[PDB]
């Protein structure tokens, strides 16, 4: 109404999710290892476990060992969180893992995954050394 408790809870909620977004979009590197996909309430996580397992082959083709190995690490993380919950919630389960190089040129793997309160209506999968949570973006504007 004016100074209710729910109000504050809302601010912190948006502030948190907002932090993960600003970082993601601001997360860029050099080696193709930015695995980011969205699993809405409809796609069986299981189908992803195996689907990702095959993706590993793509790395084998990557001449650049640095990238090949890096790619494997990403798919590995997202694969972990997947089996972790081993469930398909209504809010969905999104994962974000990419390699960002700093000034010195040191890559940073951000292994983060969970089922937030951001239900999507379409699965997405794109990895090209840079990701961008469309769901969170579009959902934010509203």
Swiss-Prot record:
Signal sequence, start to end: none
Subcellular location(s) of the protein: Cytoplasm
GO cellular component, one term: cytoplasm
Disulphide bonds in the chain: none
Keywords of the record: Acetylation, Cytoplasm, Hydroxylation, Isopeptide bond, Methylation, Nonsense-mediated mRNA decay, Phosphoprotein, Protein biosynthesis, Ubl conjugation
Coiled coil, from the record: none
Sequence position, cross-link Glycyl lysine isopeptide (Lys-Gly) (interchain with G-Cter in SUMO2): 87
One Gene Ontology MF term: ribosome binding
Residues bearing PTM N-acetylalanine: 2
Modification(s) after translation: Hydroxylation at Lys-63 by JMJD4 promotes its translational termination efficiency.
Modification type 4-hydroxylysine: residues: 63
Biological process according to GO: cytoplasmic translational termination; nuclear-transcribed mRNA catabolic process, nonsense-mediated decay; protein methylation; regulation of translational termination; translational termination
Domain of life per record: Eukaryota
Chain's role: Component of the eRF1-eRF3-GTP ternary complex, a ternary complex that mediates translation termination in response to the termination codons. The eRF1-eRF3-GTP complex binds to a stop codon in the ribosomal A-site. ETF1/ERF1 is responsible for stop codon recognition and inducing hydrolysis of peptidyl-tRNA. Following GTP hydrolysis, eRF3 (GSPT1/ERF3A or GSPT2/ERF3B) dissociates, permitting ETF1/eRF1 to accommodate fully in the A-site and mediate hydrolysis of peptidyl-tRNA.
Name of the protein in its database record: Eukaryotic peptide chain release factor subunit 1
Protein source organism: Homo sapiens
Portion of the full-length sequence here: 1 to 142 of 437
């Amino acid at each position: 109404m004016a100074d209710d408790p729910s109000a504050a809870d809302r601010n912190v909620e948006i502030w948190k999710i907002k932090k993960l977004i600003k970082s993601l979009e601001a997360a860029r590197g050099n080696g193709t290892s930015m695995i980011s996909l969205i699993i809405p309430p409809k796609d069986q996580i299981s189908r992803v476990a195996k689907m990702l397992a095959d993706q590993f082959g793509t790395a084998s083709n990557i001449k650049s060992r640095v990238n090949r190995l890096s790619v494997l690490g990403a798919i590995t993380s997202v694969q972990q969180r997947l089996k972790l919950y081993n469930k398909v919630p209504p809010n969905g389960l999104v994962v974000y893992c990419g390699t960002i190089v700093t000034e010195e040129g040191k890559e940073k793997k951000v292994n983060i995954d969970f089922e937030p309160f951001k239900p999507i209506n379409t699965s997405l999968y794109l990895c090209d050394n840079k990701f961008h949570t469309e769901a969170l973006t579009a959902l934010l504007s509203d």
